[PDB]
Structure formats: C-alpha cells, structure tokens
Amino acid sequence: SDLKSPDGNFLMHFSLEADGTPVYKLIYKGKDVIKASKLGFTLKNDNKSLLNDFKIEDTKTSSFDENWKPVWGEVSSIRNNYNELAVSLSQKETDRKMIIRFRLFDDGLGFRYEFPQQNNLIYFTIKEERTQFAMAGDHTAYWIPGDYDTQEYNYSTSKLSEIRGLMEKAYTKSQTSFSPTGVQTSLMMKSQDGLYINLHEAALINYSCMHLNLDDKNFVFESWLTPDSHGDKGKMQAPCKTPWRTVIVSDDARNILASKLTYNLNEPSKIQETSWIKPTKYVGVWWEMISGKSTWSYTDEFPSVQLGVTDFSKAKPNRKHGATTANVKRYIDFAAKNGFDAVLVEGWNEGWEDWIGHEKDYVFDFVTPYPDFDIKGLNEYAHAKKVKLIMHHETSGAVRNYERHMDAAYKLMKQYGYDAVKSGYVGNILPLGETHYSQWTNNHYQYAIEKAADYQIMVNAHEAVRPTGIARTYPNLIGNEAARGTQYQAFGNDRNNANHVTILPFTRLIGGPMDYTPGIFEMDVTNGSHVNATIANQLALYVTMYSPLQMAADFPENYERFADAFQFIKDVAVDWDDSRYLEAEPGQYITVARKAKGTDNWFLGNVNGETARVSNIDLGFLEKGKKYTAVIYADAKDANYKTNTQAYTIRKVVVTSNSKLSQFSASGGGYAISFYPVA
Amino acid sequence: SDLKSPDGNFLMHFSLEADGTPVYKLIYKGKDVIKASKLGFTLKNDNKSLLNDFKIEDTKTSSFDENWKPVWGEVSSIRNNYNELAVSLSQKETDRKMIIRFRLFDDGLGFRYEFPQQNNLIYFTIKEERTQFAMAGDHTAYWIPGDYDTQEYNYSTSKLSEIRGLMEKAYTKGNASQTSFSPTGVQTSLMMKSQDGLYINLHEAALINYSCMHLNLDDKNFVFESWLTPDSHGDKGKMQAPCKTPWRTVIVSDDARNILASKLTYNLNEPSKIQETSWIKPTKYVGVWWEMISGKSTWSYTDEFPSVQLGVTDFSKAKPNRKHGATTANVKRYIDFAAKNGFDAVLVEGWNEGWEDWIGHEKDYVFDFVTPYPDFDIKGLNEYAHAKKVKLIMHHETSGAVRNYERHMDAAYKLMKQYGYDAVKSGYVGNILPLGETHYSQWTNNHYQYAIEKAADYQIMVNAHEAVRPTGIARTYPNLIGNEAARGTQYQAFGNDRNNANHVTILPFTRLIGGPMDYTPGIFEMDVTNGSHVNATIANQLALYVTMYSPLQMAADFPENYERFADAFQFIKDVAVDWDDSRYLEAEPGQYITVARKAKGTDNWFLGNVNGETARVSNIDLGFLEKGKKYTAVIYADAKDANYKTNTQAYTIRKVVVTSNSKLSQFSASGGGYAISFYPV
Ligand SMILES: OC[C@H]1O[C@H](OC[C@H]2O[C@H](OC[C@H]3O[C@@H](O)[C@H](O)[C@@H](O)[C@@H]3O)[C@H](O)[C@@H](O)[C@@H]2O)[C@H](O)[C@@H](O)[C@@H]1O
Ligand SMILES: OC[C@H]1O[C@H](OC[C@H]2O[C@H](OC[C@H]3O[C@H](O)[C@H](O)[C@@H](O)[C@@H]3O)[C@H](O)[C@@H](O)[C@@H]2O)[C@H](O)[C@@H](O)[C@@H]1O
Ligand SMILES: [Ca+2]
C-alpha cells in the first residue's frame, strides 16, 4: 500500500476507489506533487477494458542499491538506488491479471504496468492508455505541441491554463497534432511554490510513444499514445509490459538535470565489449546545404531521378553540390589539423535530387556514390590523417526501402572503415498514414540500433522518436536530434528562441543526448537567416548540451577568422568522469562544469536566455590545493544575440577552489571556461 | 489510327471522342468483341485528371516476329508475333503526355499506358484507372467475386445480367482474409462465351510496380471497367514518370482450345533476366502436408501455452501435444516413399518454431524462418534426403507479417542454401500487416516481386501461396515456378461445398492464364480424417498431371493410400512435368478439357481428360502421335458407375497398341476424367 524514497522525502500512496479503479498519489516533503491519479487502459473491442473492478491480490516490496559504469556519459559511475512496490491486481469477472510496479528514488517516481502469462488476456489492442498525472495547481510549463510526426518546435513558457489559447500560435506549420491541450514529453514544469516537476517515460520498447493531454479544468494530464497506421495504440501480447512513466521532482532545478533516473530504469548494457564505441567530435559538409550555399544533389538536368536508370556519370553537374572529393578533402584537412575525430558528409550518394516532399519509396540505395565523390580515395585519405568519415543514411521516410538496403549499407560502412552513421526520417513515413512515433515505426528505429550493434556501428538518428534512456541498454545509440536543433537557426521564420538551450536540458535531454550541432561563428548565413546566438553562447554549448557526439557545424573559413575563440572548441572534451550543475533555471540559464575523462582538467559552460545576467560562480568543484590556468571566453558587455553576435573577450587568470568568478552573459549569450592545472 | 493482327482476323480502331476522350474498339472476324471503350485515369488531388481533352500528337507502327525458348513450359519454343500501334497523346491546357501502346496478335489484343519523361507530370497518384471493356451482349461468364485479399472462391457460371443476383451466394465467408468491393465486381482472368459462340478472356500481363486490376461490371450497358486494388491509404498507384502500366489483354477465339494454347500473356512480359537457368528444375513432389490440411496432424508442436514468444518460449522443455506432423520419423517416411517412386522432392510444413500462433492473431514476430522444432532434425533429414537423391522443399508461411519476412529473408535463404533446399513455398495467410494493407496492392505486390528477385540472386525457386495471381512474370523470372492464388485442392478438405466438380474445367481458362498453379492433385482417399468429401474420382486425379499444367506437381495424398492403389499410382509415377509440345484436343469452359503433351527430350506422350457435372463420352483423334509408329497406350479411366459423390475410387486400367490413325472413345464420369501414357514400341 505505501512507499518511500530511500531518503524519506517522497511518499507514494496506492489505493483502489469504490468501483475498483487503481489510483496513485505522490508527496514530496509533505507537498502534493501528484494528486489522486487513475491508472489502466481502454482496450479495443472489449466490453469492460482495464479501468476498474480490480482487487489487490498481492503486494511485494524490495530495495536495490548498485552502481554501474556508463560507456560514455556525464559521470564515471552512476548510482541506482530505489525502493520497489509491485502490486498484483486481479479484475473481477474476467480474472485478468495486471501488475503495477513502482520504483521510488531520491530523484522521484517511476512506474509501469506488467501483464503476466494468463488465460483470458493474450492478444489485445490498446485503444488508449489511461495513466493520469493530477497536478496540485496551475503550474508553469515549458512545452511543445503534442505531435505524432515531429518534435522540432520552439518551446512555450506558460501556465497550464494558457496552453489552450496559446495553441493557435505555438503549432507552427510531416506533422500531426491531436488536441488543443496536447503536449509532448519530456514535459518540464514549475509550481507556484517552487517545485520542479518533470513528466516523461523510460525504456520505450515495443510500444507507442507517450504524449500528454491536459484537462485544463482540473489540471490533470493523461497519457495520449501515438496511433499507428490503422489508428491503434499498441498491438500487445502477454506476457508483456509498458515502458515506465516518470515523475522527477526537486526543490532545486539543478537536480532535475543531474538525475540518472531515466537511465536507471532501462536494462543494463546488452553490448558485452564496448571499447569500439567512441565519443566523437566532428565537422562536416553539412551546414553548407542547410544554410543554402550548396546542394545535396549532383545535377538539375532531370525532373526526377530513378536509381539504376538515371546515368549520373553522364548528367550535367549543377556545380552546387557540396560533397565533392575536393571539398571533403578540405574538411578532412581541417579536422586533422585541429584534433577532430571525424567528418560527416551529406549528399554523397545517388538520389538527393528527390530527397524531400515526394513520398518516394526507392529514394536511395545507401551504397552508390555520386560521380564527384570518390568513396575509396576519401576514406583512405581520412584514415591516413587519423580521421574517420561519418556515414549518412537519410531515408526520407521510406522505411521498407531502408530495411531492405540496411545489411548491404552497413557492410559497405565496415568495408571502408565507417563506424558511425547519422540516419534520418524526413517526410511522411511510408506508406502514407503511418506516424513517426507509433509502436510500428518505433520498432524500426530499435531494429536499426540492434543491427548496427551486431556490426559494431554507432547510430545517430535524426527525426526518430525522442529517447527514453535506451542507450544504457544499447550504448551504440550515441545520439538523436528529436527536437529543434541548430538547423532551424538557418530556416528563417523565428529560428530558435534565445532561451531554447536553457530549456532543452530540462526536456529533450532527459532520455539521452542531442546532436545539436553547435559551434556557429557566422550568424548571418548564405540564405539570409539569422542565428539567434553569440559566439560565446556557441562555445558554451560543448558543456551545457551534454553529448558524446559533438559537432562544430560552421565552415573552416569561419573558424579560421575567429581562431582565438575556436581554441575552446578544440580543447573541450566530449566525455566526462564527473559533472556539476552550478546554476539552473529552465528558460533562463544553465551553468555547469565537467571534468574531462582520464584527466584532471575541467570545462565549464554558461548559456543565458532573453534577460542579460551577471552569473556568480563558486569554483569549489576544482581540487583543493591546486592552481589552475583558467581561460575565460565571454560575451563582450555590448554583445547581443540579435545585433552584436560576434563580440567576445578572452582572458587568462590563475584560480583555486577558493576563487569566485563573476561574469556578464548577454541576451542569448553565455561563457566558456577551460581549467588546466599549472605544472 | 487502325491496327490488324498478322493474320487479318482482328481489327482495332482507335479514336478520340468529340471532347478528347480516347476510345478503342476490337473486331474479330467482322464481329464486335470489344465495343467503343474509354481509356485513361482519374488522379487524386488533380483538377482535370487524364480522362479527356487529348489530341493525337503522333502515331508509330511496327511489327515483331521472333521465337524464344522457355525454361519450362507446355512447348519447347514459343512464337512472339504481333503488329504494334503506339499513339502519343497530348492533353490540352496541361500539355501532359500519355502514350497508349497496342499489340495485336493472332490470339488477340494487349494494350498499356506509358508516361514519358515530361515537365508537368512527375509524381502522381492514381485514384482509379478508367479502362473499359464494352461487351457486345449479355455473354455467359465464368467468374469469382472481386476481392482485395483472396481468390479462393468457387467459380460461378452465369449471364452477365445474373451476376448481381448471384453475388449474395458466390461471396462465401470463413476466410482469414477477404475484402469485397462491389455487387458486380469480379476478378481476372475473367472468361466469357458470347451468345453466338466466341470465347473472350479479359486479363492483364506484367503486373509490375502497380496495383492488381479487378473488373467492375456496369450491368445496364454490359461495360466492364478497371477497378484496381487500394493500398493501406486507399490509393491505387503511387506513380513516377517515366513509367508504364501493365498490359490489359483481350484473348479471343471461336475455338475454346486456342484460349488455352495462347502464349500472349507470356509474350507481353520482358525476356528472362536469369542468364544461367539450369538450376531451375521442374519438380514432382510429395509432402508432410495433407495430413494437417485434412485434420489428422497439427502444424504446431505444443498446446501447453496460451501463446508463444519466439526466443523466450523454450520448446525443448515444452509438452509435445503429440499431434505434430513434422516429426523426424514422419518426414523420413515421406522421404522413403519419394525415393522409392522416383519423386524429386518432399515439402514439409510445421518444421519451424511459431505454428502455435500461425492463424488469426495478426502477430508480427510470428516466425523466424530458421529455427527448427525440437522433434525435427533439420541436419539429419536433409542429409538423409540427399543420400537418397531427394530434396526437401522449404516452407515459409509469413502469416501476413511481411516486414517480419523481409527482415528474416536473407538469413532464411542462406539457411536454405546451407542445407541444400533449392525451392521454397511461401504463404500469406491472414490479413497483411499492418492492418489496412491488402494482399494485391501496389505495395504488397512489390514485396512478392522482391521475394522472387532476391530468391533468384540465391538461385532459389519460389512457389507463393496467397500472393497476387500471376500475369506472365515467370518469363522474366522463371524461378517463379508457381503460385496458388486460387481455390486449390486444400478446399476439398475444408467442408462446406469443397470444389465444384467442374472447377478444374474452369481454372485453365481463368487462373492458369498468367502462369501455373500448385493445385496439389493426386488424391486417392476422398473421405478424409476431418469428414470432408473431395469431389473427384481417382481418374480425374490422375488426369490433372496433364490438364492442370505446372512445372511443379504434387502428389498430395499419404504414402499409404498410393501404395494401396499402386496400379493407379503408376500413371503419377510415369507422367512427366515438362514438355516439348502440347495439343488441346477438346475444351469447353465449365464442361471438359482434353489435352496431350509430349515429355521434354522424349518421344513419349501423356494425355488427360477432366470432366464436369455431366457424364460424357469423349471421342478423340490420336493424330498428334508420330506417323508410322506404334505406341503402348495405358488408359486409366473411370469405371461406368464411377461418380464424384458416391463412387470415387472405381477405375479401370487397360493396355492397347495404337497409331496416329487410332481413334478412341472413352466414358468420363461426373467429376471424373481419364489419363493415358503413350510409350513407343
Ligand atoms: O501454410 C499453411 C497452409 O496455408 C495455406 O492455406 C491455409 C488456408 O487457411 C485458411 O483456410 C482454412 C479453412 O479452415 C476451415 O476450418 C474453414 O471452414 C475454412 O473456411 C478455412 O478457409 C484461410 O482461410 C485461407 O486463406 C488459407 O488459404 C496454403 O495454401 C496451404 O497449402 C498451406 O499448407
Ligand atoms: O538528411 C538531410 C537533413 O535531414 C534532417 O533535416 C530535416 C529538415 O529537412 C527540411 O529542411 C531542410 C531545408 O534545408 C535547406 O535550407 C533547403 O535549402 C530547404 O528548402 C530545406 O527545407 C525540412 O524543411 C525541415 O522541416 C526538416 O526538419 C537532419 O535533421 C539534417 O541535419 C540533415 O542535413
Ligand atoms: Ca531535422
């Protein structure tokens, strides 16, 4: 019946209502966080469903406290410490068995449903999941519109009661909305009385992606899963279980960011030997096309292309193509010179003339280079300079087409020494009517990952479902996008709000890292769009947007122009033995310092929102009795993300654990700091 | 503007109506066979579509006459002889280009639409094809209901005007997957006979990268119109120019026998793309099969479990339900039998984990196509078969889970090669997943195509049950050695009405146009374990090895039953499965077929008669035999009192010496037939 966090700060009461509805309640430090909340499911072609009429057949309690070592991460060792309540339910009349399993951590609550092997529930279909989160009042939320096909929205900050009226505008126009009060997870909130509340899920395997629908009379969120192509919300087979649903809570917003709860609820690694999994700093032939300077395509001779018919070797080059042998060489040369691990190349393969908007099945083959891209020479050239290429497999939504070519594509990767692939799923999923985050498409992303692992290939999947901690289980999933990235800074309209990167950690990053592609130095790009950041904001992102996969997205020539600033990007690590969140408020600021794996050096970043601010940090995370050379890369006092983006200062100062530092950060600005011991 | 067959029998007039609608008209021996008939398409989200407002921009004529050698077939050489008219159309306002290409053979008409590379039509979606066949009168038709997911129906014989009223009855239920569309909708191949004695077949050829064509009848004016199969989004073709439709075919003769002889369907398919074809082997086989179909055995190994989960359920530790057919001991019996009687192969079904959930669960991860049940020793059985000069046939039932088959496909074909399986029988029982998809859409059609093409890269032959009905594609991929794609012998074991007695006198004039069927003939025990009565005589069952052409021929009954009737079984052991020549001697759809074939590479002939509801005396000329030579004929016939309902196992066998000048007179019972081997002295 009742359950406590190890530290006694959380209490979860579970009971049944008069009619047999199962309900839960969560309490933090004597405060209601989750009020009485119903659980269970509406099932298709089922009189009675799984909503009510249960009895408690048994309860079982236990405790767990172990550490595991991530392959890559924010810390060298993570603590998995919880108390567990398993409630076995039995429904009257049907005698169907449903377990609700709760784990209560010092960071908050996770729960899931289990269906054991039984006689009167075998194959069933979920019409709707009926999992509630009753809020204590009209909290502030940081939210994106509920959508079955994209998460690439700017966040809105508002009360819960304002979501309805704001939904006309926040839903900017592959996308499918569902409700005027529907929102995605991870969802971040802050109560009128200073509690930070995160609703999300963990271990999204073999199940549809959960969104939340708000009842804005009573402030109750309810699970609203993603329909597949037939409109269903889970083809289930017992014995089976749901992903966990997570309520991470703290009176200190920094603890939300530091939580490993999401990972903790996923199964331990299923990869036995993990040393081939290598955190990666990279450049690429990428932003050129994103910002309208180059094309993915080789030719414009043809209205459409047909692979195996169009003869590319005899087509007129349009001469805008980014992925030329000469251009890739330049990026290789730049990566090698500056200690980067890899270079991504997009537009390398036949088919880019028809990549977007055509709902085209046989859109790519994932193996055949354009005539102007010498796959063999370039891979040899890169390896000779101690660099790798990153394979790119945009699918343009044609999932069957990808699965058929996948083995051959991974083989070709291995044959030329590619160990990582950036995938994509742009456009409607084929065949039309399918959604990007259904149980059905979710299984594709899962299969891609699993198969990549069999080849010892790493995967970074754009346009896929947002992560839910599955990289603990498959640490070859070194990234996704699955949110609005730097690319939108090049797409005109509103680009990304100045405070975007002060919300992403509190939402999107819960579940796993993002390939945000930071590192922009020229904010006014070829197609006229204005990147809403300062240079110092861009340097800070290598620390404030944690990821084992970190791009420097701008052109070689722009880094050359601002070589002094670029030093931080060259110096910063991408893997860590420890991390300390120093300051954080969603929508406003994040400051964090991290200690580079296998070193005694630290790197710090600050990102700042709309309101310019003076940050004051304690350098207590440094080792006692040591001196460090700090180099501080900061906004100039008149820097500004709209009108003065390229104004930064660089200064050196020797510091100790007892030093304090005070730093202006501009509007949409930030700062970065390297700390190296003195010898 | 006008076109003739090489022999002058057919004239095809093409015109445009006052408003620019394209129309065609087909005339046989001065008689209207296809009246003025509209052509073009309704396109989705398009102002104007492709229905009218065309002008003729150009026409082009040509002729073609060459022979090709099939890998397997009814004849050693096939003649491809036609005259061609290509009409380039251009639409007003949009300036879109559409070519209609016509080929006129001595056997009839084929036409298709082509879209060349152009500026104003790239990506488009067909909402409906508007291709008509205006009939000359209220013909007699032999038809099954139009359906997106099964062709497993008994045929009906009726006037066109009677189709609507008969449709409550001909649309029989209890199928795992079936979806009707119209009270006057029918499938192709569709066979007809006019009130005045012409035989008319409507069908298509080269069903590639396009949705399967059905026909909807307007029974006021006797006009059939193309009604294609919707995909999961309701569309009837995601197209990209340059592209083309399959051909639409109107096969006509005043002699029913010429419909059966026509190679027009094959002629309209592209030449073989398999360069080296000698691994492609016509096959006579038995199997662990009918036992399960007739309710004596199971496909499943255990009944301990409500459901099974592959990779979780430990089968090695489950209670055998003890009904499982594909035991090591039982397969060995069929291997022993096959080797003893000169059969090439043995099919085995239920060999692999997952059969406990194979039907009606709409289950994705239903099979893995590689993991044997504990009671089936894959390694030993394959070695035992090869040691006795026999092969196994792999079975890959998918249970509708197409993505699950595609993901396992390479590993499954690899495993075939590792153990010396060179042919696979596939299945698509149950609704295609994910729900909403149909068995004959453009999308699922592409899967069947991919399975065949991939099989070819592995030098594997394919036999696909529940797939789309064939359209001559085996010329291009002769590793497609069969389909079912119609109501086969299995329904003889499924109670209800089983198969009408005249079923096999209609299939050749309908289903067989496009390619062979794995009909699984050869039943000697007509009263089977589950109580169902097979509607045939023994002699009918022998005849089918000749009257139902296929390079893949099963003897579906149990070893026991063939040994019991060993005298009759001789014909099955003797009969060939590939032919240098064939002659249709008599044929009338729904009533009778008699045909003789010459075994490839030999001077031996084999003949079969199958007979419908009415008992009849057949009277044939043996002139197909070589002049001046004597043959031992053995005639396996119905006894006088044989009958498909009440006296199924009564046959006579007599030997007689014959020449090209012999004439034969032979009674065939109701649902009966006769079979004859001719060997030179
Ligand atoms: O691979 C397994 C077999 O699969 C195909 O045929 C199976 C056949 O199953 C169902 O028909 C069975 C039958 O069950 C009776 O009890 C019932 O009265 C009857 O109506 C029902 O149809 C599906 O309905 C059907 O679509 C399917 O064809 C192959 O063709 C077999 O050779 C193969 O062994
Ligand atoms: O694989 C390529 C690309 O795929 C994802 O990007 C998705 C993105 O695609 C569209 O926008 C691309 C945009 O780029 C240039 O600016 C062109 O010049 C434009 O006309 C074109 O729209 C779409 O508009 C977006 O809404 C969509 O999210 C990856 O995330 C990328 O990193 C990758 O390069
Ligand atoms: Ca994107």
Ligand SMILES: [Ca+2]
């Ligand atoms: Ca069947």
